[PDB]
Amino acid sequence: LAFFRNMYDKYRDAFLSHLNEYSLEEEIKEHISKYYKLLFDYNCLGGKNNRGILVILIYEYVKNRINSSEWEKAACLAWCIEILQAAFLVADDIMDKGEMRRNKYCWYLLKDVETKNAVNDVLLLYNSIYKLIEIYLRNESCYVDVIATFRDATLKTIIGQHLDTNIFSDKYSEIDVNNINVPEQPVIDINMINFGVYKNIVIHKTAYYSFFLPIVCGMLLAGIAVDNLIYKKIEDISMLMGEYFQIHDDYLDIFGDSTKTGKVGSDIQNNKLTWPLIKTFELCSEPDKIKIVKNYGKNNLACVKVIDSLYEQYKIRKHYESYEKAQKAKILSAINELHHEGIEYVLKYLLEILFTGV
């Protein structure tokens, strides 16, 4: 619980210790270690760690208490999720052309790193996960299923980003394998602006790895049978939380202090299907849909200001407040159908600190 934040060095060093036994000259081993120590420290730390904590809490309250050897396996899984998060955020910042993350410059922007290194380093963080899982859970019975869950959550997240990045592109309105020169100028597509499509995306890009994966890890580790019907109930609660979480992420993109959120809002300029876009479209007048189509997705201050002002005009802040209230209720209703008092507590607890933390 507090156990968690202090176990970081243990797992970081376990992994770095694997690197250190490679057949490399000694000057090179030292340099590798400096680099990969910074990679982990810079990218895994400084987060709210809600996904990691969720593995730890699910583990405790699924059981009747847990020795400090069993805790070591729990916290390992917990840091793996936080490393997965690190890997994804490094990648997302390359794809979304990010500036700031957790209040510092994005990894890929550092001049001793650059994109060439950033990409390589994503795949390293990602694989570190499974090396760590092998070190601490090779001999557990859930081993194969735990690595199977990380794998299948990751795949859903990958398709998730794929749609996040491409739902408005010419591709989706045959792929031209001879064009390496003429870039499409980003333009929204009206057919795609609807909650149905938005849910598909947000569920795949967020719900599985942020909520399903950590919940299922804890349970798997605590001995709960994979075949059990509680998993399909957990999957549906995970879908609702992810929707709830991502829409909040989208709200912060427009209305959050970039010093408080740690990052800079870019959804409009990057042509993203976001909840405020969809809500404004279902509420606004025809003259304003034209105004939306001719200003969205353009990396141009005056165009962005048009869209932000429409969001002020159509009182989107008030509409969010209203959504947050209704969804929180749909979610609590789903939690109370689990009939498991421990998980129910953890999920209610999570639902409260989802935006604060700690």
Which residues of the shown chain bind Mg ion in the complex (CB under 5 A)?
A: 92, 96, 164, 249, 253
226 touches a second copy by CB under 8 A: no
155 touches ligand K9H by CB under 6 A: no
42 touches a second copy by CB under 8 A: yes
51 touches ligand K9H by CB under 6 A: no
CA dihedral 156, 161, 163, 169 (to 10 degrees): -160
Write out 112-155 in H/E/C secondary structure: CCHHHHHHHHHHHHHHHHHHHHHHHHCCCCCHHHHHHHHHHHHH
Name the segment binding a second copy (CB under 8 A); options: 69-77, 103-111, 257-265, 316-324: 103-111
177 touches a second copy by CB under 8 A: yes
Name the segment binding ligand K9H (CB under 6 A); options: 23-31, 153-161, 230-238, 281-289: 153-161
Task: Return the residues of window 174-233 that contact ligand K9H according to CB under 6 A.
Answer: 205-206
Strand (E) or helix (H) holding 100: strand 100-101
Angle at 40 between CA 251 and CA 266, to 5 degrees: 25
Q: Are 204 and 218 in contact (CB under 8 A)?
A: no
Annotated binding site: 92, 96, 164, 249, 253, 267
For the chain, helix (H) and strand (E) counts, in that order, are 16, 2
Q: Are 55 and 81 in contact (CB under 8 A)?
A: yes
231 touches a second copy by CB under 8 A: no
The 10 Å Cβ neighbour count of residue 68 is 8
86 touches ligand K9H by CB under 6 A: no
Structure tokens at 115: 């994109």
197 touches a second copy by CB under 8 A: yes
Among 52, 86, 96, 239, contact with ligand K9H (rule: CB under 6 A)? 96
Is the C-alpha dihedral spanning 307, 312, 313, 319 positive or negative?
positive
Q: List the one residue out of 44, 250, 66 whose CA is nearest residue 132.
A: 44
CB 307, min distance to a second copy, A: 22
CB closer to Mg ion out of 121 and 249: 249
144 touches a second copy by CB under 8 A: yes
CB closer to ligand K9H out of 88 and 198: 88
Q: List the one residue out of 150, 151, 7 whose CA is nearest residue 75.
A: 7
Helix (H, G, I), strand (E, B) or coil at 300: coil
**Phi, psi dihedrals of residue 338, rounded to the nearest 5°:** -75, -35
Name the segment binding ligand K9H (CB under 6 A); options: 24-32, 119-127, 169-177, 298-306: 119-127
Alpha-carbon gap, residue 268 to 116, rounded angstroms: 27
Region for 211 from its dihedrals, namely left if φ exceeds 0, alpha if ψ lies in -120 to 50, beta otherwise: alpha
CB closer to a second copy out of 181 and 356: 181
14 touches a second copy by CB under 8 A: no
74 touches a second copy by CB under 8 A: no
* Residues forming beta bridges with residue 105, ordered by sequence position: 100
CB closer to Mg ion out of 121 and 164: 164
Among 181, 185, 259, 356, contact with a second copy (rule: CB under 8 A)? 181
CB 349, min distance to a second copy, A: 28
Name the segment binding a second copy (CB under 8 A); options: 5-13, 20-28, 257-265, 271-279: 20-28
CB 25, min distance to a second copy, A: 6
Q: Are 202 and 149 in contact (CB under 8 A)?
A: no
CB 250, min distance to Mg ion, A: 6
263 touches ligand K9H by CB under 6 A: yes
91 touches a second copy by CB under 8 A: yes
Angle at 215 between CA 332 and CA 267, to 5 degrees: 75
Indicate which of a second copy, ligand K9H, Mg ion, none lies near residue 205 (CB less than 5 to 8 Å, by partner kind): ligand K9H
Residues within the interface to ligand K9H (CB under 6 A) = 88, 91-92, 96, 119-120, 122-123, 157-158, 161, 205-206, 249, 263
